[PDB]
Structures are given as C-alpha cells and as structure tokens.
A paper describes a structure:
Here we study primary-active transport via P-type ATPases using functional and structural analyses to demonstrate that four simultaneous residue substitutions transform the non-gastric H+/K+ pump, a strict H+-dependent electroneutral P-type ATPase, into a bona fide Na+-dependent electrogenic Na+/K+ pump. P-type 2C ATPases are obligatory heterodimers formed by a catalytic α subunit and a auxiliary β subunit. While the sodium pump is electrogenic, generating an electric current as it extrudes three Na+ and imports two K+ per ATP hydrolyzed (black ions), the gHKA and ngHKA export H+ and import K+ in an electroneutral fashion (cyan ions). The exquisite ion selectivity and stoichiometry characteristics of these pumps are determined by their ion-binding sites, formed between transmembrane helixes TM4-TM8 of the catalytic subunit.
The Cryo-EM structures of Lys794Ala and Lys794Ser in the K+-bound E2-Pi were solved at 2.80 and 2.99 Å resolution, respectively. The global structures of these mutants were indistinguishable from WT − ngHKA. In contrast, Lys794Ser displays two strong densities at sites I and II (valence 1.03 and 1.07, respectively), representing two bound K+ ions, as reported in a similar gHKA mutant. First, Na+ augmented the activity of both mutants (Lys794Ser at [K+] ≥ 0.5 mM, and Lys794Ala at [K+] ≥ 10 mM), but not of WT pumps. Transient currents were small in WT- and Lys794Ala-injected oocytes, but much larger in NKA- or Lys794Ser-injected ones. The Q–V curves are sigmoidal for NKA (squares) or Lys794Ser (triangles), while the small charge moved by Lys794Ala (diamonds) and WT-ngHKA (circles) lacks sigmoidicity. While the alanine mutant mediates electrogenic transport of 2Na+ or 2H+ for 1K+, the NKA-mimicking serine mutant mediates electroneutral transport of 2Na+ or 2H+ for 2K+. Asp945 forms a salt bridge (dotted lines) with Arg949 in the E2-Pi structures of WT-, K794A-, and K794S-ngHKA. Mutation of lysine 794 to serine or alanine reduces the ion selectivity of ngHKA, as both mutants can be activated by either Na+ or H+, but neither single substitution suffices to flip selectivity.
Residue numbers in the entry:
A (entry chain B): 28 to 304
B (entry chain A): 51 to 1036
C-alpha cells in the first residue's frame, strides 16, 4: 500500500543516511592521522625509480630521420617536458635561487613543518644539456643517428641519494669520480651483442659530471616546495648501427639506490632504439 | 491392459472364451503360437538411464550455467590479451578454477542425487521358476516363463502360483494374499463367484501368491505384467521420478540468485558500453560480476550438512537411502501409514479375556516378560489348565534362551497366540502337557468350529479324566449346561446367558477374535481309567459342558506407536491410516493407537447413539470417518478432496494398492507434503508416489525397502518424530547458511561496481573473491548447521509448501542490502586507509584507474608529488586488495556470530554453546593469515604481506554490524507483529 511504501522508504532513507554518516566519520577520523606534509610510509616508493623523458610506448624508439613524422611525437613530448626548464620560467628570484654551478652537498632547507612558509628551489638551466638543450640544436638530436634521451630520477620526498663509496672500484676509472656530490649514471648495451653496435654514448650533465648533482635533494613534497625542478642528465649516442634494434640499459649506481628483478624501472632502464635508414 | 475381469464365467464359458479344455488343455503348437502373440510370462524390468548420463546432466544444474559462461568469457579475454600482446595471464587461472568448481559441484550434486536402481529384483523370492501344466492331456513341469494364458495349471500346497488363474477344481485350497492385501491370514479358495470385486472373488488365484495347503486346478487368465502383481510392479517402478521439496526450494533459490546476477550483469554491461569502454574491460567486468554473484561453495556445503545429518540419524538406527529424505521429513503435513506391520506387531496375541462375569486386560507388549490380571482369584486355574492342555501349537527346536514372544511356533496363528500367552503367564507348558497323557483324538474342522481333546489329570488325588473344548463362543455356549463362577459351577441361566452375550458383543465390537473355553470332568463310574476312547465322537459325550472363560486376540499395536502418533498430531501433522484390512479391525486399532480421538465419533456411531437412520444424522457433527474400499472406488476426485478437507481423522480400510496410490495423490493435491509408512509390497506404489516413504526395517519386505526413501532398522516409531525435529532444524539452519553466504556475495560485488563507476584502482581482484567463497566461508557455513533450536520446534505447525519458501524476499533483502553494504563500507574504509598512508589521498583516486593501469607510465605523481613506477603501483593495488579481503573476513566473523540466531539474542543462545562456530572462526583467521603471509610473501595470486594495523581497521564496522543486528532482534522480540516483525524478521 501507499502508507507501507512510505514507511519503508523512510526507514531505508534513514538507515542509508546513518550508514553514510558512519562511513564518512570513520574516513575523517582516519584522515586526521595522516599529515599533509609527508607520507606516513615510503615502503613502495622507497628506492626511487629511473625514467626517461621521451615517454616511449613499449621501451621502443624507432624512427627514420628523413621523415619528420617519425620523430615528431618524441620531439613534441621532449619539448613539452622541457618547457618548464627554460630560463624565462625561472626569472623570479622570490622562489628560485642561483645555487652553485658545481655539485655540492645536499642542502637541508628545514624540517617538514608548516612554519618557514615555502622553500626555495635550486634552478636548473638548459645550457648544461649540451647538444640536447634545443636552444641551438633543432629537433634536438633526432637527426641522422643522433637520438637524445633525458634521464631523470623519480621524485621521492625527503630522500637524499648516497653516491657509491670509494672503498670499491665502481667501474672503469672515472677520473672525475667526484663521489661526494654526484650520483653516477651509466648506459651500456643490454646484452653482449648490443655493445658492438651501440657505438659511443655522450653524457651532458651539470658541470660535466655524469650524474645528478646532490645539491638539489632532498625533495620537499610539492606542498612546501612547489615548482621544484629535478636535475636532468641528457644522453646522446651520435653513432649506432642502422636498421638494427639495440637494447640499451641505463643504471644508476649508489649505496642508497636499489635494484629489483620484478621491477625493471627501479634504478634501471630497458630502452630499445632502431634508426631506420 | 485387460481390465475386463472375468470370474463369474462358468467352466464352459471359460473354455469357450480361451478355447481350451480342462482335460485336454492347450496344445503345444497352440501354446507356441500364444507365446509368440502375447509373450513370455515375466515382468519386464524398467528402463534405467546410464549413470554417466546423470553425472553429465549434473554439470548444468545449479549455477553451473553461469560458471560455464564465465569460463567462456575468461577464454575470450585471454585470446584478446594474446592478440594484443600481453603476458599478464591471470585469466587462464580463473577459467581453470571455475571449471574445477563446476566439476566439484557436479560431483557433490550427483552424490546427492537420489539412488535410482530398480525394484524388479525385489520380486525374486516370489515369481516361481517352474510350474506344472497339462499339455496334450499330460502333466509336464514347464518353466514359468513359457506359461501362456489359456493352459491348465495345477497347484499343490507350499508352492507359488505360476500366474493369475481362475480355480476350477479346488479341494480345501488355502492361499496367502499378503502381497496384495498385506494380511498374512490364510484365505479359503473355492470355485464359485463369491464377491463381485475380483480381488475378493475367493475363486481366483493370484500370480506370485503362495498356496499354504491343499490342492487346486486353475486356468491361466493373465500373465506377466497383465497380472495384479505385474501392475503393482509397474506402478512401483515406472512412477517415482519427482523433485523433493528441498530440491524445489534449492531450485527457487538458484533462480533468484541467477536472476539477480543476470539482471545486474546486463544493466552494468550496457552502462559500461555506453561509457566509452573497450569490449575487453566490459568482458572482464562481466566475469567479475558473475564470480561475485554466484556462491560457489553453497551447494557443496548443503550436501555436506545433509550428509552429516544422515550420518547422525543412521547412528540413531534410521537408515536414509536418499540424502534429501532427511529434510523431506519434517515440514510434512499428512502421514499415510499402513496398519498391519507398521502400526501393529503383526503377531496375533490375546488382549482381553472374560471370566467370572468381569473383563480382564492382558499385556500386549512384545518385550514384556510377564503380566498379572487378578490371577489370585479362583476359576483361573481351570482356565490355565484348559488353555495349556487344549492346544496343538509347538515351539521350534533350539529356542531355549530365545525370547518367548520372539520365538517361532509351528501352528495356527491363534494356537501360537495361546501358546505364547500360556508360556508368559503359566510357565513351561511342555512339562504340563507331558504330565497329562493326552488322547490322540483331537478332531477340529472348519464346519465343526470346535476342537476337543480328552485328557487325564496328573493330580494323584483326582487322577480322573479331563475333557477340554474351545471354539466359536455361540456353539460352545449351546454345548454348555452350566457355568463355573469362582469355583462353583452355577447352572446356566437367562441372566448368565445375557451377560455372556453382552460380553461377546462388546469383545466382537472391539474387533477381536473371541473364542470360548469349556471343560468337563468325567467321574470314574461312567468312564474308568482303562476305558478306551474313539475319536469318531461316538465313545464320549459332546454336550452338557461347563463354560469357564472367554478371551480374544487383537494383534495389538507397537508399544511406542501411540506416543509417537500423539506427538505427531500435537506437532500439527495430520495422520491418516490406509489399510487393506477389514473396517472393524482398522477402526479398533485406530482408536487404540490414537488416530481417532476417544471423544470423536463417526457418523455411524452418532446414528447408533441417537437410534436413528444414518442418512438422518447430519455429517457436520461427525469428526471421524471410516471409508471402505468400495466407497472410495465409487468416489469422484471432488468427493475425495471434500472428504479429506472436511474430516480431521480418517481411516481407510480394504484398499488395494491402486487405491492407496489414489489416496496419496489426493492428499498431495491439497498442496501438502505426504509421508507414507509401510512394510509390504502393496505399499510400494504409495511409497514411490509419496514425497518421503518410510519402510519398516525388520518387518518390511524387500520391495518396501527398495521403494522407500528411509528405512527404520530397529522398527521404532519415535524415529518419525525425531526425523520431524531434525528436518525442521535443518530447514532453519539452511536459512541461516544461505543468508551467511549471500552477505559475502554482496560484499564482494560492491567493489567492482564502485571500480567501474568512480574509476578507482581495482579495490579487489576476482581471485580474491574466489578465495573468499571457497576458503574462509566453508567451515563457518558448515558450522551454522550445528545450531540448536531457538524455540520449541514441535509447537510450530508444518510450514506451507507454497506460502513458506526456504529463501523468501525478506532474507534476500536483508542479506543483500542491509548486511552486504556494511561489509562493503568497512572494506572500503580499510582500502582508503591502505592507499592514503602510502601517499594517495582518497580524492586523488577518482578517475585514476586509466592512468594507474597504463604500463607505459612509470612516473605517476601522488598527492605528495612523489613519482611511482608501474610495478610499485600494482604492488600497492595488491596490498589494497589483500586489506579488503581481510576486512571482508573480519566482518564475516561478526556476520556468522549474528547469523547463528534468527530471533534470540546472542546472550540467550550462548556464545560458546556451539564449538563448531569457534572452529569456523579459527579456520577463517588461519586461512587469512596463510593467504596473506605464506602466499604473498612471494607476490602471487595478487596477495601481499600486510602491516599489523591493517588487520584491525575493520573491527569497528564488525562491532557496528553486530550491534545493529542485536538491536533489530531485540525490537522483534519486544514487539511481535508491530510492522517490525512483519518487515524486519526474516
Ligand atoms: C545500484 C546497485 C545496487 C546493488 C546492491 C545489491 C542489489 C541486489 C538486491 C537484490 C534484491 C533481491 C530481491 C529478491 C526477491 C525474491 C523474489 C521472490 O520470489 O520473493 C518471494 C516473496 C514471497 O513473499 P511472502 O508471500 O512470504 O510475503 C508475505 C508478506 N506478509 C508477511 C505481509 C504476509 O514475494 C514477495 O514478497 C515479492 C518480492 C518483490 C521484490 C521486489 C524487489 C524490488 C527491487 C529491488 C532492487 C533493489 C535495489 C537496491 C539499490 C540499493 C542502492 C544503494
Ligand atoms: C572497543 C574496542 C575496539 C576499539 C577499536 C579497535 C580497532 C581500531 C583500534 C586500533 C587499530 C589501529 C591500531 C592497531 C594496533 C597498533 C598498530 C599501529 O601501530 O597502528 C598505527 C597507525 C598509525 O601509525 P603511525 O602513523 O603512528 O606510524 C608511523 C610510522 N613511522 C614512525 C615509521 C612513520 O594507526 C592507524 O593506522 C589508525 C587508523 C585510523 C582508522 C582506524 C579506524 C577509526 C575508526 C574508529
Ligand atoms: C577445508 C576447508 C578449508 C579449506 C581452505 C583452503 C585454503 C587454500 C589455500 C591455499 C594456499 C596455500 C599457500 C601455501 C604457499 C606456501 C608458499 C611457501 O613459500 C613460488 C610459488 C608460486 C606459488 C603459486 C601458487 C601455488 C599454490 C597455491 C594454489 C592455491 C590454489 C587454490 C585454488 C582454490 C581457491
Ligand atoms: C570482529 C567482531 C567480533 C565481536 C562481535 C560480537 C561480540 C559480541 C559480544 C559477545 C556476546 C556477549 C557475551 C555473551 O552473551 O555470553 C553469554 C555466555 C553465557 O550464556 P549462558 O550459557 O549462561 O546462557 C544461558 C541461557 N539460559 C538463561 C536460557 C539458560 O557467557 C559465557 O559463556 C562466558 C563469556 C561471556 C563474557 C564475554 C566474553 C567475550 C569474549 C569473546 C567475544 C567474541 C570476540 C570474538 C573476537 C574474535 C576471536 C578470535
Ligand atoms: C555511486 C556513487 C555515489 C557518490 C558519488 C560521490 C562523488 C563525489 C565526487 C566528487 C566530490 C568532490 C567534492 C569534494 C572535494 C573538495 C574537498 C576535498 O577535497 O576535501 C577532501 C577531504 O574530504 C572530507 O573531509 C570528507 C570526506 C570525503 C571522502 C570522499 C571519498 C570519495 C570516495 C567515494 C567512493 C565511495 C564508494 C562507496 C560505495 C558504497 C556502495 C554501497 C580532501 O582531504 P585531504 O585529502 O586534503 O586531507 C588530507 C589530510 N588532512 C585533512 C588532515 C589535511
Ligand atoms: C535509494 C534508491 C535509489 C535505491 C534503494 C531503494 C530502496 C529503498 C528500495 C529498493 C528495493 C525496495 C524493497 C523491495 C521489496 C520490498 C518487499 C515489500 O514487501 C516491502 C517493501 C520492500 C522491503 C522494498 C523497500 C524499499 C526498497 C528497499
Ligand atoms: C538499479 C539496478 C542496479 C537495480 C537492479 C535490481 C534487479 C537486479 C532486481 C530487481 C527485481 C529483481 C527480480 C525480482 C523477481 C524475480 C523473479 C524470480 O523468480 C527470479 C529473480 C527475479 C527475476 C529478481 C532478479 C533481481 C531483480 C531483477
Ligand atoms: C654538440 O656540442 C658540441 C659542443 O659541446 C659542438 O662542438 C658540436 O658541434 C655539437 N654537435 C653538432 C652536431 O653540432
Ligand atoms: F500391513 Al498392510 F496394507 F495392512 F501392508
Ligand atoms: K561469489
Ligand atoms: K518416494
Ligand atoms: K558468498
Ligand atoms: Mg503392512
């Protein structure tokens, strides 16, 4: 009947309202515990991953230098990423500070508290990415056999990378080791066969060192330190076999940095490049 | 189907009809032609479907259709994944799991699916192999199969009748029709048309019946299936393929669940299609919905609980052939029971004996050791002596320690009854009989209806002759000159004759075989000790006797039968007695047992009391009715329905097996579950037709056991009430288990709907819900079946089959909406807690699934600006799924706690009363711990190790569920029928 329907509908409305109220109350109580400054746990994102700028589909970079459309996607994506790194975007000194042009020790900029307002960010100029800044170079590197990829380290809040100790020889004599304020990064053929065809690799970083300067870290979470610019390391090959697909792996070496077999992008690369003549 | 019975025909008419001669008989060539035309004289076995066909048919019953559809969708999704290269897999696992679940459910259902088999083998003891038939005017032993209608057959004593024959030359032939009527009393045979009904014609022998004594010659009139036994076998075997009430309720529940699942799947598939969704995601979501909506372990749990109840009942000496028969009993509305052998010991015994002008009552128990009925009074010694000496029955050798009631006696039924009585009361008659040198003259004949035996007393003082006489009371009285009362032999007078006549009338009206006992003393003057005697009745007198006592035999009911009948009637079950015995005995036994109440009276009784014609008395007053076979024969179905509706207590007498089946069908037409109890071949059709058929163990025939769903090995009638209680309890516990499973079904279902709608990261995977269904919910579901009764089960009336269903709307509404949503909310709280602590706030998860699942993206930004790789995102997703599963388990613990009672509070029922509940809780916790740590330690099946706090996040929601359910039940108890009991109660 109409009356019974009204009574039942009223009961269900009240019951569901109470259920929703309890759910939202429990959610708010839980949220009170978490802090907007720093995450409660960093188990999953503890060891930062390594990622490339071109953002390619399946770790494959295949293009023909003759046809612009082949590399237009990569060039556009690289430009989109690098847009915020232009010197014009850092003209404001209220939040950007001209930090040392030479790698320095990580600089603690305070604690994770709402006091001290915001934090300043060490600016990063595109000039250090020689041959890949795009200032003088056109289409960056994607001319005949000159692929260029920008390597960046995944942002982890309150993370200070530790360069490998000089106790053990990392690799071939680096000469410019400078472990105090640089995190080494190296790129080599994935398998023995690839090393023959990969040719040579050119690294462009801040001050000429092949790694991320430590002065930029630690990151402060995009709330205390908005507009944060992470350091970049541009890699350009400039010589590799034509019409042959090369598997290239880039690795970041550090005592703090870790690796995993399950996760291929945890401090390592798996990138395949093929320049179709 | 030759229903045109022909027994009124004379010998010449039979010869003309069948073209045969009594002297000549059928010719060999004619016999062969008739064999070719009609066929062999054998019962054709019924067609049995191969067990393999049944097993395969079991692969589509229940939810198996939905599971097959899900497996097909999983295969399609895997093919699509292979085409668009993706090594994710995880779909082949789902398909294999679904196929295995289907196979397991099919096996369980098959083991639960009745017994099948055949009943023709039961007639092996009957159906004699060979017979004597006259061919070409000569007698030759021929196999019964070759026997054909028309030929002349001769039957001696102690052999089975070769086929349905019409006796033509019978000399004192006696036959046993226990197969047809169910009564073992020998029936006299003759060659004249006595009764119109062929079953009682008295001049037709029946196939498979036994000729007790005498010789007769008959002409075959039916063979094979055309015989009465053949038709009974056809009815017993052919019919009997129907669904039990529990199966119907399970089918209704399956229909409800499948309809809900299909409707939700269609609606949300259309919605996803109209939301710009790839067919791959649509099929994945469809598979998830199908898995969530189908309770996989419910049917297997039901089978297991039924098996457990069957095991307990078998331990109670109540064998259960068909598994569903445990539930079928209980919820029964009508009980049609056989009189002889079922409600009665089937052993003729003396019940009442009248002497000294007053009635005594004698114990009729089968296990009774002795009884006393004013034995101290005089006139008892003479009766004891007359009973002991005037008897011919003897105990079989080797029965020293065997109980006297359970002993075997070689003699007439009445003679055996008197022998048992004398042994119980007097003592060892062998010594007493030996003491007296009985004279071989013991003449007894049917026409005489009296038998006398001359004896000489063993008393040294008297040492005189003692003559003992018993027989029909009337002729015994008219051979009685005086009656001995308390020793003195008072001369027979008008007053004494009137008292004797009244006592005989009352005893006969109680449906008892009354026999008169009298003896005379022979002084030595007339007949000296050496005087020789002749059995020709010429050497001794045969009149002027001294009547002593009178006694009757009733074949009393079983000791426990009356109490069981009273309890069944008090439980709201209507008890109807259908018997093939005479109406007087049936009515007497019904009154004694309690089928007919003492105050209740029949229309004939009312007319007799008012001394008016039967038609004059209005039928409204009469509350009991006794219907003979003929009245039921000439009764339209509407009249039968009206009779069943109007009369609370009904007794059917002189009913053939077809009439028993008709009565059962008429009872079933009133939307009533009928249970039939029998122990005879004539009960086979009724046992098959009835919803549940109980056959007596020791006294039951092989046919009754083969056609019976339940067997009482110990022949105790209280097993009926025990089974009623067990069935009602099983029904309640099944309701509880079904609700328990449905709650978790909805709890699993909700997350997928939210995932599709709001685009959150997958809160829970399909494999996780499969583990919930086939893991933690098994032991609790079985434990819920051990719950004790909340109230008095018997007090409630039987549940209506139509109005009351196992799964009703209130149960589904409560399980799906009320409790399912609470568990979904608790799981979502745990899920949001898991995600937020890692840097993903709840508001950032909206519409994030598309980017979350993109394998190309390895720098997804969270609420704190951190970047996540693809693998880390999926590991966090697995952690959230595991947390959701653990929350569901934690809330299912409280779900079980609340579900263990439907009306009582947990305080009244007792938390620790049922230990299987705690076993199930421990099983849930152990399974969750294993799946979270053992599995998941190495990430597998979307399981990952959980932090400690994630186990206890959902506890408050479980507490809230328990509090809400307790408040609901409290308000139900406080206010019965106040719009809260009507709606909230399930
Ligand atoms: C948006 C996504 C939501 C997902 C949440 C889960 C939704 C799943 C819900 C499932 C509900 C299934 C209902 C099953 C019905 C069984 C049908 C049936 O065979 O029942 C038998 C009954 C017999 O009754 P009786 O004679 O014993 O009664 C006697 C009454 N006395 C006491 C007054 C005499 O027949 C009846 O009563 C008539 C029963 C009629 C049932 C009408 C159902 C109407 C619609 C329900 C949809 C629910 C939507 C919920 C949305 C929630 C969003 C938050
Ligand atoms: C009446 C009897 C029952 C009462 C309720 C019982 C169940 C709820 C009670 C407790 C559950 C949580 C505690 C479980 C046991 C302690 C485990 C634990 O250690 O839990 C801590 C977490 C918060 O950890 P943290 O941030 O301090 O860790 C910082 C780690 N470091 C230092 C590395 C950054 O507590 C949390 O998650 C809080 C989660 C908030 C939402 C919970 C539900 C609220 C609803 C009410
Ligand atoms: C009787 C009522 C209760 C029934 C409860 C059933 C619980 C079933 C749960 C089984 C999980 C056992 C996990 C043992 C793992 C040890 C690992 C060590 O260290 C490297 C290993 C890769 C492992 C892959 C998975 C292998 C085996 C697990 C298979 C489970 C299949 C279950 C299907 C039905 C849900
Ligand atoms: C997740 C959520 C789980 C929690 C959900 C529900 C818990 C509700 C609270 C427990 C129920 C109340 C306690 C209770 O109603 O007790 C009753 C029994 C005594 O009844 P009776 O035989 O005298 O009645 C006689 C009846 N007449 C009078 C007719 C003869 O009291 C006893 O036996 C002794 C115990 C009574 C004292 C409370 C013990 C509390 C312990 C455990 C509670 C359950 C925790 C489960 C957590 C997971 C475990 C792994
Ligand atoms: C069928 C679906 C029907 C419902 C659809 C609802 C759609 C809602 C979508 C958008 C509305 C956004 C408007 C508010 C945003 C701005 C304010 C704000 O963002 O405040 C937010 C907080 O909020 C609140 O306190 C109130 C709680 C809001 C909870 C929202 C949960 C959304 C999830 C919904 C799925 C539920 C599924 C349930 C299924 C059950 C089936 C039976 C932001 O807090 P925070 O993260 O910065 O806190 C950081 C920590 N602290 C606060 C200490 C600084
Ligand atoms: C809020 C809207 C959009 C969705 C939920 C609507 C709820 C209130 C509806 C959906 C199904 C409805 C129920 C369907 C069936 C019955 C059984 C009937 O004998 C009494 C009413 C009752 C119990 C209804 C009550 C109201 C109900 C629960
Ligand atoms: C808004 C949307 C999600 C609500 C969906 C509710 C659907 C699934 C509900 C509402 C009414 C329900 C039906 C009510 C009656 C019957 C008849 C029964 O013999 C089979 C189940 C079936 C067919 C039910 C299936 C589930 C059902 C269709
Ligand atoms: C790359 O940069 C170097 C200077 O660092 C310059 O000499 C060279 O010409 C550049 N490459 C090309 C192709 O011009
Ligand atoms: F004992 Al019956 F029919 F009376 F089987
Ligand atoms: K399910
Ligand atoms: K049956
Ligand atoms: K379930
Ligand atoms: Mg019987």
């Amino acid at each position: 009947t109409g009356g019974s329907w009204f009574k039942i509908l009223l009961f269900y409305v009240i019951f569901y309202g109470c259920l929703a109220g309890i759910f939202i109350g429990t959610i708010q109580v839980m949220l009170l515990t978490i802090s907007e400054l720093k995450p409660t746990y960093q188990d999953r994102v503890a060891p930062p991953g390594l990622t490339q700028i071109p953002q390619i589909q399946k770790t494959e970079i295949s293009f023909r230098p003759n046809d612009p459309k082949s590399y237009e996607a990569y060039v556009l994506n690289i430009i989109r990423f690098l847009e915020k790194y232009k010197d014009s975007a850092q003209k404001d000194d209220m939040i950007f500070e001209d930090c040392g042009s030479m790698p320095s020790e990580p600089k603690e900029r305070g604690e994770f508290n709402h006091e001290r307002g915001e934090r300043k960010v060490c600016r990063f100029k595109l000039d250090w990415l020689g041959n890949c800044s795009g200032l003088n170079d056109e289409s960056y590197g994607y001319k005949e056999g000159k692929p260029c990829i920008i390597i960046k380290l995944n942002r982890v809040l309150g993370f200070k990378p530790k360069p490998p100790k000089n106790e053990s020889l990392e690799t071939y004599p680096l000469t410019m080791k400078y472990n105090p304020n640089v995190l080494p990064v190296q790129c080599t053929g994935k398998r023995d066969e690839d090393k023959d065809k990969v040719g040579n690799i050119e690294y462009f970083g801040m001050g000429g060192f092949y790694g991320f300067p430590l002065q930029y870290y630690p990151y402060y979470g995009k709330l205390l330190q908005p507009k944060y610019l992470q350091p970049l390391l541009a890699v350009q090959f400039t010589n590799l076999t034509l019409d042959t697909e090369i598997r290239i792996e880039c690795k970041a070496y550090g005592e703090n940095i870790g690796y995993s077999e399950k996760d291929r992008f945890q401090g390592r690369f798996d990138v395949k490049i093929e320049v179709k003549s | 189907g030759m229903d045109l019975d022909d027994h009124r025909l004379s010998n010449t008419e039979l010869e003309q009809k069948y073209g045969t001669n009594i002297i000549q008989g059928l010719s060999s060539v004619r016999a062969t032609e008739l064999l070719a035309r009609d066929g062999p004289n054998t019962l054709t076995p019924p067609k049995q479907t191969p067990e393999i066909i049944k097993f395969l048919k079991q692969m589509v019953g229940g939810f198996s259709i939905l599971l097959w559809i899900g497996a097909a969708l999983c295969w399609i999704a895997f093919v699509i994944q292979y085409v668009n290269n993706s090594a994710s897999l995880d779909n082949v696992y789902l398909g294999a799991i679904l196929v295995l679940v289907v196979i397991l459910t099919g096996i369980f259902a098959y083991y639960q699916e009745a017994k099948s088999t055949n009943i023709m083998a039961s007639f092996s003891k009957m159906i004699p192999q060979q017979a004597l038939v006259i061919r070409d005017a000569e007698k030759k032993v021929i196999s019964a199969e070759q026997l054909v209608v028309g030929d002349v057959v001769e039957i001696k004593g102690g052999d089975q009748i070769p086929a349905d024959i019409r006796l033509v030359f019978s000399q004192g032939c006696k036959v046993d029709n226990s197969s047809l009527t169910g009564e073992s009393e020998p029936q006299a045979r003759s060659t004249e048309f006595t009764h119109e009904n062929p079953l009682e014609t008295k001049n037709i022998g029946f196939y498979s019946t036994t000729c007790l004594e005498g010789t007769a010659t008959g002409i075959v009139i039916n063979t094979g299936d055309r015989t009465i036994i053949g038709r009974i076998a056809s009815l017993a075997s052919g019919v009997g393929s129907e669904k039990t009430p529990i199966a119907i309720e399970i089918e209704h529940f399956v229909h409800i669940v499948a309809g809900v699942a299909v409707s939700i799947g269609i609606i949300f598939f259309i919605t996803a299609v109209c939301m710009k969704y790839y067919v791959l995601d649509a099929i994945i979501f469809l598979i998830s919905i199908i898995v969530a909506n189908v309770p996989e372990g419910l049917l297997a749990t039901v089978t297991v609980t039924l098996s457990l109840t069957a095991k307990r009942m078998a331990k109670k000496n109540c064998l259960v052939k068909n598994l569903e028969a445990v539930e079928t009993l209980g919820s029964t509305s009508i009980i049609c029971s056989d009189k002889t052998g079922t409600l009665t010991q089937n052993r003729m015994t003396v019940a009442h004996l009248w002497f000294d002008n007053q009635i005594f009552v004698a114990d009729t128990s089968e296990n009774q050791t002795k009884q006393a009925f004013d034995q101290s009074s005089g006139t008892w010694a003479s009766l004891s002596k007359i009973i002991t000496l005037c008897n011919r029955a003897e105990f079989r050798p080797g029965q020293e320690s065997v109980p006297i009631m359970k002993r075997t006696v070689v003699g007439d039924a009445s003679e055996t009854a008197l022998l048992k009585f004398s042994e119980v009361i007097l003592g060892d008659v062998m010594g007493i009989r030996k003491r007296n040198h009985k004279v071989a003259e013991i003449p007894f004949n049917s026409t005489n209806k009296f038998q006398l035996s001359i004896h000489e007393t063993e008393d040294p003082n008297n040492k005189r002759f003692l003559v003992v006489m018993k027989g029909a009371p009337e002729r015994i009285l008219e051979k009685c000159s005086t009656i001995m009362i308390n020793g003195q032999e008072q001369p027979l007078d008008k007053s004494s004759a009137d008292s004797f006549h009244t006592a005989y009338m009352e005893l006969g009206g109680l449906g008892e075989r009354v026999l008169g006992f009298c003896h005379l003393y022979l002084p030595a003057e007339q007949f000296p000790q050496s005087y020789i005697f002749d059995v020709d009745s010429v050497n001794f007198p045969t009149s002027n006797f001294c009547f002593v006592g009178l006694l009757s035999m009733i074949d009393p009911p079983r000791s426990t039968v009356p109490d069981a009948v009273s309890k069944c009637r008090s439980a709201g079950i209507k008890v109807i007695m259908v018997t093939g015995d005479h109406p007087i005995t049936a009515k007497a036994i019904a009154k004694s047992v309690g089928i007919i109440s003492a105050n209740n009276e029949t229309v004939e009784d009312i007319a007799k009391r008012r001394n008016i014609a039967v038609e004059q008395v209005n039928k409204r007053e009469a509350k009991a009715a006794v219907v003979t076979g003929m009245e039921l024969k000439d009764m339209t179905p509407e009249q039968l329905d009206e009779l069943l509706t109007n009369y609370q207590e009904i007794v059917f007498a002189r009913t053939s097996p077809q009439q028993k089946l008709i009565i059962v069908e008429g009872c079933q037409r009133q939307d009533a579950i009928v249970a039939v109890t029998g122990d005879g071949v004539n009960d086979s059709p009724a046992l098959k037709k009835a919803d549940i058929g109980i056959a007596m163990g020791i006294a039951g025939s092989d046919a009754a056991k083969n056609a019976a769903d339940m067997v009482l090995l110990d022949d105790n009638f209280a097993s009926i009430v025990t089974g009623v209680e067990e069935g009602r309890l099983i029904f309640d516990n099944l309701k509880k288990t079904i609700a328990y499973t449905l709650t978790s079904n909805i709890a699993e279902l909700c997350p997928f709907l939210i995932y599709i709608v709001a685009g959150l990261p997958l809160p829970i995977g399909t494999i996780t819900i499969l583990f919930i269904d086939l893991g933690t919910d098994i032991i609790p579901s079985i434990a819920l079946a051990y719950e004790k009764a909340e109230s008095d089960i018997m007090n409630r009336k039987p549940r209506h089959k139509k109005k009351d269903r196992l799964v009703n709307t209130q149960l589904a509404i409560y399980s799906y909406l009320h409790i399912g949503l609470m568990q979904a909310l608790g799981g979502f709280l745990v899920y949001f807690t898991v995600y937020a602590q890692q840097g993903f706030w709840p508001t950032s998860l909206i519409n994030l699934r598309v980017a979350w699942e993109t394998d190309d993206i390895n720098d997804l930004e969270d609420s704190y600006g951190q970047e996540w790789t693809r693998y880390q995102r999926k590991y966090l997703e697995w952690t959230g799924s595991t947390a959701f599963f653990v929350a569901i388990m934690i809330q299912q613990i409280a779900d079980l706690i609340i579900r263990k009672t439907r009306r009582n509070s947990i305080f009244q029922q007792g938390l620790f009363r049922n230990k299987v509940i705690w076993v199930g809780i421990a099983s849930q916790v152990i399974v969750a711990l294993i799946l979270s740590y053992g599995l998941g330690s190495v990430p597998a099946l979307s399981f990952t190790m959980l932090r400690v706090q994630y186990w206890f996040v959902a506890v408050p929601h479980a507490i809230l569920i328990w509090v809400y359910d307790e408040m609901r039940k409290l308000f139900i108890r406080l206010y019965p029928g106040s719009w809260w009991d009507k709606n909230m109660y399930y």
